[PDB]
């Protein structure tokens, strides 16, 4: 994916010197969101959708929550820039207009919207049963972030201290290696460690828009990012400095998904493992980072940023990345 | 499809509040764009997919202008509120990291943001051959429109000045019909009028920022309009004042569609007729609005307002929409 990307990225790169000097001028891609210039102020913006955990909801019937993971995936993706979320837009590519489908969507819309602060303003209905074999929700999210507040992981040093906020679950990364795992063999109603399969695939992404955002203005931060497609190697973004980290212990969908012979390096590639969104923060701000994050959710003291360079090394796991 | 929209649309109007008298602020769905108030300007924002135009590229083995596609139609509808298009970020829904794909699709991308203008900032690429036959192209895009500068219809008055800017053929819209009715019956290398059936149907969409963005700047303009999904009835999305036109002779792609049995009330409905995009000025910018437009493509007048409330009536075919 990444090599097919590169012909994508490196004409995108070449288009920024339409908006040179103007309005909409931006920055490189490659972070979590792009920025725009707009004087006083950055835009941030985002794009991502839900991905296959689609299927497993029309599967099932259960479509009241991939809007959440819809919205979280996006307004999270804006806080790994630093920016305060502010409205989005739902791209719905769907195999047919289904009346109750569309019903059910759009609860965990309104709830994943309440949830993050924003505002639901646009979109687009494509129905295109010869390309989509289900119901593909994804969005666009902008945010805003003053000028000298971006938050991009340039300012991360050895040393510095990090921190994981836990995952609801599974959230809307390594679907596709859960579902053809997994179901085939225990089916959807399978039930593990007191829920079904199904309740384990479909848990809603989790939204750190509250407590980042406190975080950001409370204590100096040096970097945030979403543990999303890729896994821990998203910290990778943020620097080149190495990481030294003890992950928290291997735990439901998780675990399932590694007593079915899936590897543990590759599942930190993958998965999120329990971790849904890491912050680093300069030590001195360890304590009440914690502090305020732990008012919101569980969060752990994950490790340090090291001067070995390039390596996320799992050290309770034994694996380096 | 209208009606299981009307469940999200009902939603996201309820998230509106989450900005009330905040950065961010929205208009009502239902416009081309949203508008979103950021103080001294706001900014636009419109989401679309390239749809099943995407089938004929991948047969023929040339993405090298889908690109354009998915560039056009949200730049042009930036351009219905009266919008500056500056940035955009693509969704890009494969079932394969194909690298010739890839490469091709990255060709059109550049030619279209240099056309329109626009920086292409981002976006996301997801791999998932479970549900997605093909190779879907779809992009978010934002642009600027100062305070008492929007045009969003509501200045359209009886007598008004009605013109349209050609299309360069099928566009975005109308393609599965197209497609269903045409490729079994005649093969994608039917030749007609000394094109292959496929080069009709792959034929890129028009860019009508330079022209529209020049118009804005030099006349009075009371509407926009691009043709796109529902054909003429998106003037019904400006005004609830009548419209009085006669549309160009069927021509190309649209005259083997009608002679295939597709009644023309539908047509217009459905397909863009040879015209890509309306605009609505008083009768006294008439000639300057056609000398400006014809500078950058072969446009017309058509017609004008009436006090018939809610009525197109396109004269020469003797429909009433
Ligand atoms: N899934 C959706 N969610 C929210 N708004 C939508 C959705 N689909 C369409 N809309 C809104 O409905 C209006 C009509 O949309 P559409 O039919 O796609 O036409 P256009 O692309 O010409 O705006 C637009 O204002 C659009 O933002
Ligand atoms: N099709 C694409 N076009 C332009 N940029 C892209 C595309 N796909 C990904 N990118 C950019 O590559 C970077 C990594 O994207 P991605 O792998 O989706 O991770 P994330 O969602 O965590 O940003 C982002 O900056 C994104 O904007
Ligand atoms: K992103
Ligand atoms: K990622
Ligand atoms: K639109
Ligand atoms: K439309
Ligand atoms: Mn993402
Ligand atoms: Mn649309
Ligand atoms: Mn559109
Ligand atoms: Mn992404």
Redesign the pocket.
């Given at each position: 994916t990444a090599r097919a990307?590169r012909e994508?990225?490196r004409t995108?790169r070449e288009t920024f010197k339409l908006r040179k000097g103007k309005v909409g001028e931006p920055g490189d891609?490659?972070?979590?969101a792009?920025l725009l210039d707009f004087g006083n102020f950055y835009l941030a913006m985002?794009t991502?959708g839900v991905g296959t955990k689609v299927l497993v909801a029309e599967a099932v019937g259960k479509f009241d929550t991939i809007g959440i993971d819809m919205i979280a995936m996006n307004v999270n993706?804006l806080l790994c820039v630093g920016a305060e979320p502010l409205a989005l837009v739902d791209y719905f590519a769907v195999k047919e207009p289904n009346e109750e489908v569309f019903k059910q969507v759009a609860k965990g819309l309104y709830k994943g919207a309440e949830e993050a602060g924003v505002a639901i303003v646009g979109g687009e209905t494509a129905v295109m049963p010869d390309l989509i074999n289900g119901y593909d929700l994804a969005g666009t999210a902008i945010g805003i972030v003053e000028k000298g507040k971006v938050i991009t992981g340039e300012r991360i040093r050895p040393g510095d201290s990090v921190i994981g906020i836990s995952s609801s679950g599974i959230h809307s990364n390594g679907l596709t290696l859960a579902r053809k795992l997994l179901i085939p063999k225990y089916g959807l109603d399978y039930e593990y460690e007191g829920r079904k399969l199904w309740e384990w695939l479909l848990e809603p992404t989790r939204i750190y828009v509250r407590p980042i955002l406190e975080l950001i203005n409370s204590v100096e931060v040096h970097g945030l990012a979403?543990i999303?497609?890729g896994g821990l190697l998203?910290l990778k973004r943020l620097t080149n400095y190495g990481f030294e980290l003890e992950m928290p212990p291997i735990e439901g969908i998780f675990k399932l998904i590694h007593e079915n012979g899936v590897p543990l390096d590759e599942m930190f590639r993958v998965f999120n493992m329990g971790v849904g969104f890491i912050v680093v923060v300069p030590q001195e701000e360890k304590e009440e980072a914690l502090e305020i994050l732990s008012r919101h959710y569980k969060s752990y003291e994950l490790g340090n940023v090291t001067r070995e360079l390039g390596k996320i090394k799992v050290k309770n796991y034994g694996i380096t990345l």
């Open positions: 990307l994508i990225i995108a891609i490659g972070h979590y792009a985002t991502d993706d979403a999303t497609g998203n």
